[PDB]
């Protein structure tokens, strides 16, 4: 109960919502855009329309009660940092954030983010790893 | 054995740097010299080249590699043309980063052996990373 | 015998109108209803459809046509994906308007039987039209 | 001698220059951009860098001495109409102009253009014709 | 009856409508924008909302029946030239047009405009004249 | 007798050229050298100067003119400041081109003896020009 | 005694809120209703009005105030016209926020008793605030 | 010696540099733009051209040795927050920052800024105070 919450349902965020659901996990999916919230209705325990930067909507959401909260806001560094800021204020156990660039990463580190994700770069490392496995582990 | 990465953006450059760290040799290539220089220290050989040019593909020796990764980004046309050419050279394993849905669809019909979607794929990784929290 | 034009822009719509004037039957198709209506009076059948969707391609019956013209413009990805699909249906003659050089290059390797370049092609027409001045 | 002149060396204009050259015809190729003029050096009797809207450069060019002058200016209705305007003033026997749209066509008709070309539409008719030939002429 | 018609009710056009009305003249005021048409309701015999570039609306307007028609379209060279083009087709006795610049002037001359107005420059001459009068006519 | 035009745009330059044609002497001034040169042949003296600078106004000798025309355009602030300064120098006749309604309103309270509105004013001219058709 | 603030931006609204906190009565005014509402709870009376309109200035009763602050921002013309009008009403103290140098220059010649430059002025405050560190 | 440093020489920053100088205080003035640095040459002990967001240039500057450092970067929230971030890393005793808006303020609070300045609002309070003084203190 109330273990995972994902804010920002783009390619990255919506993808963790789907995988979680597939794995049988309950998940809180949120976005400011309603068309996005309706797109993940069949995958989330609860899919709410909310502005993550709004300190009150965060309360109506009950976000203070989640062990992990993922901020997957995309090309909006401000909404992303602001949200992570409020989350850190609600003392959320684990806040993971998708970073847009170096600058964003630098502020997130000090803003409270426990883990920063750089999709492009990070996948680059995992692809390198798969390549190595193909030969090293020989297969 | 052989590894070749075409397109040294955040995705492509990252795989070159990782392969290097993991003690692997890698051919790094990009049409932009500035990109090639940024990864020269990580690749066995870093070469400036337009991957859509067959002649540049041959002077490159790309046909001799076991795995070639197409990491072209925004230039979707170059990406699909490049993988079309690599397919003609019968490269054993051609992996391509997909820009979008239509792109993925052409790539699968074009001969891409593996199609990568950084955002989506990383998303699944994070979900699985999230579960392991109680493993 | 059968003629099918996908993409009713200036180029595509024009060919539909001409075929009609020349007493030929033609299937007109476009993803945009507004475009489909604009040529409804010129085609035997004008249908709204996304040419990249295999199911819409089948409910359309496109596989039964002798000549299919892909006149998608700016959406280069839809254009190449659409011709890739038509090729799977073994359409006898698939003619495609090329947006640019890379586009032409993928199209030729993809199975386009004829590649049209309005600007260039019309340019040759005008030159030949210019000479005839003294013929 | 001095039969054809092409102003505007884009896909359309450069293409008539090439075809003319292939057919053994002498041609005057002009453009305001030097990189364009250098690209058609091996196809034109003479390739000059000039602003077709400049009334003087038109004289230095000797354009008044050509039977046919093609205005192949692209996405610049103003430069296109202006040029055709000056050409009509020099009393050029035949002025052909590539039109961008309906509006452009309407002004060109009254401005002096003897023939208006709409590449996209016009090629559409010729493609229809080729299709008909495939079946009608049976081949 | 049906002597003057003004198309384009901006500062320039609306001003001739007002002056005409003050002088006791009947005037046809037209504009595509309704807020403009409503602003000159108390000054024009008839104030209609119409697109001057639309060949049909020009007929519904009855513009073919006016001795003078003023095209006072502003920063829209295309709508301005297009309108003057249609007007010249309806064989209007006198078509006066406000020109935006040199290019516009050049096309209007050939498009049919009987008189071209350049507010800024033209007023400049009249101001020079007033200055001269102050001293020469001594007053 | 003395005439001075500040701001050589279409409006201001035009009055300088007309005064010249009418055999009158005129001081032409503008902050932009390019504008000053364009009218150098029409003015007795064409000087580059920022009309808002009192010192440049004095080295100019503007205070000795009977009529000074402020034809600054878009820079409404410079326009009103310039006329404020000319008023301090008690110039007998200061005529100013108004950019808009608020501008006209400040100018009248500031000391502008005549406020010109090219668009509106020309509009009245045309209406009167229209009537004379049957005079 | 009487205080009137025209223009409820960050600067103007702030002074209204402070005066309120300090137990002072204040007339808040702005052409934008949304701005007027935002400060309705802080002013004795918050009124929507265009400060450039003499009639709205009279129905407002502005002429009865000892201090009137013009805090119009970007609309420099409204700002100078408004202070020009207040000067006609002989308001004892008219303080105006200056947008820039030319603005300050017109304002001083127009009758502004005090000209405020938030950025500059606050800058001096901080410097003096910095020194006091060792006082 | 090395007491005050001001980064960003706009209206706000340049103004504290001037006042400090007038009061006989030594001050370090810095900006990325050279024309700005040259404008405050006669007011600062030292006026250097540097990118405050560059971690190295901050070292060449010797900023680690100042009791107070003012970040007066204007309409560039990113450069402003980034700089304050590096400054907080160098453990500067007092970092004051000009905030552009609420969002900026919120990040600065957590980023390390010891004092946040909102020129417009803050001056508003001081103006209110001057008004009160006029009457209350009666003068
Ligand atoms: N303040 C916010 N609160 C909640 N969700 C937001 C907020 N701002 C943006 N979002 C959502 O986060 C997502 C942005 O991630 P993004 O990568 O841009 O989507 P995509 O990958 O499809 O382009 C969008 O679905 C957007 O609606
Ligand atoms: N035809 C081509 N041949 C070789 N490299 C190319 C070609 N087209 C694009 N590239 C390279 O592929 C890379 C794509 O990464 P990209 O996503 O566009 O930049 P980024 O990852 O920083 O956002 C670029 O560095 C680009 O120079
Ligand atoms: N996937 C698709 N399936 C069917 N039609 C499409 C598809 N994508 C684009 N089109 C249509 O192809 C036409 C291309 O003509 P276009 O050049 O883009 O407009 P225009 O010729 O006026 O400049 C458009 O009318 C567009 O709606
Ligand atoms: N005033 C001018 N005089 C001469 N040439 C011009 C003028 N204006 C534009 N051109 C040229 O006409 C051509 C425009 O045709 P265009 O279709 O835009 O080129 P492309 O097909 O490659 O996009 C360009 O080569 C341009 O430099
Ligand atoms: N096609 C058109 N048909 C009729 N009126 C038009 C057309 N296009 C523009 N107008 C009108 O002509 C006027 C433009 O003159 P303008 O100078 O731009 O107004 P203003 O002086 O207030 O800026 C506007 O009132 C506009 O609505
Ligand atoms: N402070 C000033 N002192 C002197 N001249 C000025 C000042 N400010 C602007 N000007 C000049 O006044 C002229 C105004 O004419 P303008 O309307 O702005 O250009 P245009 O008439 O071509 O549209 C410009 O040439 C400008 O350089
Ligand atoms: N003519 C006017 N009469 C009364 N109030 C006005 C007038 N013009 C502008 N204002 C008001 O003055 C205020 C100026 O503050 P401003 O700086 O423009 O916004 P902000 O302080 O948020 O940046 C605005 O709220 C505006 O509505
Ligand atoms: N990264 C940076 N490092 C140092 N100085 C900077 C940096 N970014 C901006 N600045 C400077 O800070 C100042 C911005 O303050 P600003 O308010 O915009 O100036 P102004 O008040 O004249 O508009 C400018 O002088 C700018 O050059």
From Swiss-Prot, chains A, D, E, H:
Membrane disposition: Peripheral membrane protein
MF (Gene Ontology): identical protein binding; monoatomic cation transmembrane transporter activity
Swiss-Prot/TrEMBL keywords: Cell membrane, Ion transport, Membrane, NAD, Potassium, Potassium transport, Transport
Localization, UniProt: Cell membrane
Domain RCK N-terminal: 1-117
Presence of the UniProt keyword Ion transport in the record: yes
Gene Ontology process terms (BP): potassium ion transport
Chain residues that bind NAD(+): 11, 31-33, 51-52, 73-75, 98-100, 104, 120
Deleted gene: phenotype: Impaired potassium uptake.
GO cellular component: plasma membrane
Record flagged with keyword Oxidoreductase: no
Family recorded in the similarity comment: Belongs to the KtrA potassium transport family.
Job description of the protein: Catalytic subunit of the KtrAB potassium uptake transporter. The 2 major potassium transporter complexes KtrAB and KtrCD confer resistance to both suddenly imposed and prolonged osmotic stress.
Name the UniProt record assigns to this protein: Ktr system potassium uptake protein A
Source organism of the structure: Bacillus subtilis (strain 168)
Name of the coding gene: ktrA
């Amino acid at each position: 109960n109330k273990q995972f919450a994902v804010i920002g349902l783009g390619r990255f965020g919506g993808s963790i919502v789907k995988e979680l659901h597939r794995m049988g996990h309950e998940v809180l999916a949120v976005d400011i855009n309603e068309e996005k919230v309706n797109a993940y209705a069949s995958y989330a325990t609860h899919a709410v329309i909310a502005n993550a930067t709004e300190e009150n909507e965060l309360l109506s959401l009950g976000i203070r009660n989640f062990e992990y909260v993922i901020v997957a806001i995309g090309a909006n560094i401000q909404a992303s940092t602001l949200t992570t800021l409020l989350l850190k204020e609600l003392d959320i156990p684990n806040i993971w954030v998708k970073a847009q660039n170096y600058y964003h990463h630098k502020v997130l580190e000090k803003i409270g983010a426990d883990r920063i994700i750089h999709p492009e770069k990070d996948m680059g490392v995992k692809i390198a790893q798969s390549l190595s496995d193909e030969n090293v582990l020989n297969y």
